[PDB]
Amino acid sequence: DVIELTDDSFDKNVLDSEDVWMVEFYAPWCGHCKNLEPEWAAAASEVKEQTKGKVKLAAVDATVNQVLASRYGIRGFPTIKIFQKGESPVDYDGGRTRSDIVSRALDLFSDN
Numbered sequence: 001d002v003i004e005l006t007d008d009s010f011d012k013n014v015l016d017s018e019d020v021w022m023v024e025f026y027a028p029w030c031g032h033c034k035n036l037e038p039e040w041a042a043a044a045s046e047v048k049e050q051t052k053g054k055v056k057l058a059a060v061d062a063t064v065n066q067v068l069a070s071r072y073g074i075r076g077f078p079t080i081k082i083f084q085k086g087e088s089p090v091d092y093d094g095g096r097t098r099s100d101i102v103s104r105a106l107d108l109f110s111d112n
Contacts, residue, residue, distance in 0.1 A: 018085065
């Protein structure tokens with residue numbers, strides 16, 4: 001489903017991975033993040049089904065993982081960043097529909 005990542009777990013999970021990671025950085029009081037939670041989970045199920053985990057969806061609570069928040073310049077919420085092997089992350093620029101997120105995921109899968 002959605003993997004919860006932390007300052008301590010991020011680099012081995014994500015940076016050292018052969019898989020692509022789409023990571024939502026959120027704050028726990030942020031209503032837009034709360035609204036997105038169920039759609040993020042739904043997208044994560046479909047992506048898992050389509051890619052068998054070659055693309056993973058994850059989340060980071062930026063407020064308690066401040067090394068990551070600083071590293072990736074998180075200045076607002078929610079912020080979704082896409083990580084591919086050996087690259088700096090890029091920002092996701094689509095909507096929260098399942099089709100939008102799954103489209104980006106399959107694009108990533110095709111080329112990874």
